[PDB]
Structures are given as C-alpha cells and as structure tokens.
Fold:
Amino acid sequence: AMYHFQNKFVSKANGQSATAKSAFNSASRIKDFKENEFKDYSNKQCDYSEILLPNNADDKFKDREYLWNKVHDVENRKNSQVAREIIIGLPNEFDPNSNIELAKEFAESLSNEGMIVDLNIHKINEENPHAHLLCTLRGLDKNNEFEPKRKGNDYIRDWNTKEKHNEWRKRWENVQNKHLEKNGFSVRVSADSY
DNA sequence: CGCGAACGGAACGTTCGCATAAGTGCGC
Ligand SMILES: [Ca+2]
Ligand SMILES: [Ca+2]
Ligand SMILES: [Ca+2]
Ligand SMILES: [Ca+2]
Ligand SMILES: [Ca+2]
Ligand SMILES: [Ca+2]
Ligand SMILES: [Ca+2]
Ligand SMILES: [Ca+2]
Ligand SMILES: [Cl-]
Ligand code: NI
Structure:
C-alpha cells in the first residue's frame, strides 16, 4: 500500500562489508577469511532468505559464506565497492506467502541480467515489511570467475546507469501492481512524484 | 561523467571510486 525503492552501494571506503551485510540481513553467522573474524548477527530477525543465481552460474554461489568471500577476493582494494543493496517496501496487506513470491519475482528479474541476488525479507506481519537485496557488481564468465567492472573509463555492465536505475524503479512498480491485482486488491502503487 | 587514487608488480599502464530517485509504513 506504499512505494519505496532504494538503490545504494556497499563500499569498503566507508567501513562496510559484504560479509557483515549478508550476515546482518540474513540473521546468520558468516566467516570472513581475509580478516579471520566471525560476522555473527544470528541474534537478528529474518523471515525469509534465498540466493538467486543467473543462468550460467555454479551451485557454489548458493552458499552465502562462499559467495561474499569470493566477492571480497575480487574486491581486493581498501576502497572497493563490494556490492549493491536494493531495499524495497512490501505491501503490508499481503500475507507472508504472497509477500515472498512478490519479492522473489523482482529479484529474479535482476538475476536475469544477470547478477547474483542475496534476498532477505525483514519484519513480515508488521507495519513495514521490506526486502533487502544484496547484488554483485560483476558478472560471471565461462570459468565461473568475476568479470571486470571497468575498461578504461567505460563500464562492462549497464547496471549503474540512470536509465537502468529508472528502469528498475518502474519495474518494481509494475511487478508490485501486478501482484496487488492478482491477490484481489483495488490498491495500486506509483514510482514518480510531484 | 572524466578526474586522480589505487592496484599489480615493483614502471607506469590500467582498473577503479564517485553514484542515479525517493524521503515512508525509515531510523542512530
Ligand atoms: Ca562518512
Ligand atoms: Ca529464515
Ligand atoms: Ca500492520
Ligand atoms: Ca599490492
Ligand atoms: Ca606469477
Ligand atoms: Ca631499477
Ligand atoms: Ca550515476
Ligand atoms: Ca526500511
Ligand atoms: Cl536496517
Ligand atoms: Ni531491514
């Protein structure tokens, strides 16, 4: 019954971590190898967790611990951006089961592009059901290795452009409105303002 | 987006950070 779409970067230049975020959002304990710490946020809340892969991805990446360590490996810089976090507002009139399928579908539209998505749904059965989406900033190659982000000043993927940003905003509107109609609600949602 | 910082390899050529719209039923 409300629109909310946030697109942000997870950067090490601000003391952030992919292992910390994945643990904080999934309410699990994940080991960081390069720092030999244990990111233990298992005392947090999380009602649904899933990792969604693109077509040419190995089943290894469905493990949350391996994934973000493999990512940190490629992001071997002190200012390296490790991931992209997308949080979305879920309609609070939805039951958990239908709220999952809604968030699951939009996440699969991202893995079709094709990123790896760490989907975690927070506080269902509450006033503000939302879903965090940790997405990789690189794609996979023929050898299941991360491709580079950059070639000179140009990008390899179009994931970081305004056109793709505004596309994702409109996509979340359409997907959400579709599920709102399917479950039998007269309520719809919009992305723009003014 | 073009700039300089940050890589790998131990020069300086090359990959990167930077970050979009939108402000609630947010939240330290
Ligand atoms: Ca700061
Ligand atoms: Ca769970
Ligand atoms: Ca409620
Ligand atoms: Ca070095
Ligand atoms: Ca060598
Ligand atoms: Ca010399
Ligand atoms: Ca931009
Ligand atoms: Ca929120
Ligand atoms: Cl939070
Ligand atoms: Ni949350």
Q: What stands out?
A: Chain A has one domain: 1-194. Helices of chain A lie at 18-26, 64-74, 96-108, 162-182.
